[PDB]
């Protein structure tokens, strides 16, 4: 069931995933030695082995659904704060 929610409502479920990754990385590395005792935040990436779509196949019914597209990087902004 989870890997289906994650395909349909990825926004409000990646949050729960990344908040469980932080509660597991706490009971595994503790006691942190001396210089760190505040628990950091774990950016959960995710990959898959599924057939890729294409940019020309992004119809508006795919709004807020995990997609998987190939391409070629053409530009790159400068990093900023957020």
């Amino acid at each position: 069931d989870l890997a289906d929610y994650l395909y349909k409502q990825p926004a409000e479920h990646l949050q729960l995933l990344e908040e469980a990754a932080k509660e597991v990385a706490d009971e595994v590395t503790r006691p942190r030695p001396s210089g760190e005792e505040v628990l950091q935040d774990i950016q959960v990436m995710l990959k898959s082995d599924a057939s890729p779509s294409s940019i020309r196949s992004l119809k508006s019914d795919m709004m807020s659904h995990l997609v998987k597209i190939p391409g070629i990087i053409i530009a790159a902004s400068a990093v900023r704060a957020k």
């Binding site: 069931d1 289906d4 395909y7 898959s48 082995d49 599924a50 057939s51």
Partner: protein
């Protein structure tokens, strides 16, 4: 595989649907549309298909295959689970093993592939099985591109009491079937597609005989023989005697090297000298 690439390649729905002629390829489209399977989910791998479709797939497929004349669609097999993601049907292990042992590209003596296929039956080697499933795919997609040749070109000669065919080197993916063991399956699927394709009433009940070149240097071909096909064929072949007596009559050069008798290696020049005497012998 995906649910689409496995309908186009099973040599039981690739025959009924006649998935080699544009006129009947729309039959597959209609079959898919009658179930409510989007044409975009059917093209994607089966493990990634949505969870709301696959509920009763194995029933909505058996049903909508009555409406097309395919009533033997469910078979009785077994399946195994090891752990979290390991789920095999007893006819996936078979197609993977059968294609680790008969890989086309040869890397040594005759007993170098045998070892690698004997290896992939113990659970400590799931990295060979999971690899021998990419050969078994590559083979099945390079069989329906040959049975599509000898049926959009009519290379099945009705040489009398039995059909007959042959192959050409120039056609791509014909060196894959050079082995004298991976040739019987190609012929046995060719017969199944043919019998469903032809309009006659005689050809639909004649055994097939096939030859494809073995060795260019010795200039020899390999020949097989398969029983007359039908739904309830007893499976009692009879060519091990025919070929023997024919080579005896013509007094040519033959080799009954294998354990089964119905597979022979024959000089490229004794082909007709052998075949005519065989035609007369079977009569």
């Amino acid at each position: 595989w995906s649910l689409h690439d496995s309908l186009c390649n099973t040599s039981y729905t690739a025959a009924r649907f006649k998935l080699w002629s544009v006129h009947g390829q729309k039959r597959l489209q209609e079959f898919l549309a009658d179930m409510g399977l989007p044409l975009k989910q059917v093209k994607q791998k089966f493990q990634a298909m949505d969870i709301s479709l696959k509920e009763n797939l194995r029933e909505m497929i058996e049903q909508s295959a009555n409406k097309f004349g395919m009533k033997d669609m469910r078979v009785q097999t077994f399946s195994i689970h090891f752990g979290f993601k390991h789920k095999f049907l007893a006819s996936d292990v078979v197609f993977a093993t059968m294609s680790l042992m008969e890989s086309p590209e040869k890397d040594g003596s005759g007993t170098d592939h045998f070892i690698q296929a004997l290896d992939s039956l113990s659970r400590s080697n799931l990295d060979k099985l999971y690899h021998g499933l990419e050969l078994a795919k590559k083979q099945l997609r390079a069989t329906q591109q040959t049975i599509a040749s000898c049926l959009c070109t009519n290379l099945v000669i009705s040489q009398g009491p039995f059909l007959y065919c042959s192959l050409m080197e120039g056609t791509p993916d014909v060196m894959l079937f050079s082995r004298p063991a991976s040739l019987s399956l190609l012929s046995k699927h060719l017969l199944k597609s043919f019998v469903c394709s032809t309009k006659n009433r005689r050809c639909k009940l004649l055994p097939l005989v096939m030859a494809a070149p073995l060795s260019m240097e010795h200039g020899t071909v390999t020949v097989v023989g398969i029983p007359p096909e039908t739904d309830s064929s007893d499976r009692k072949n009879f060519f091990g005697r025919a070929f023997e007596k024919a080579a005896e009559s013509t007094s040519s050069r033959m080799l009954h090297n294998h354990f089964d008798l119905s597979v022979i290696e024959l000089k490229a020049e004794d082909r007709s000298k052998f075949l005519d005497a065989l035609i007369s012998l079977l009569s």
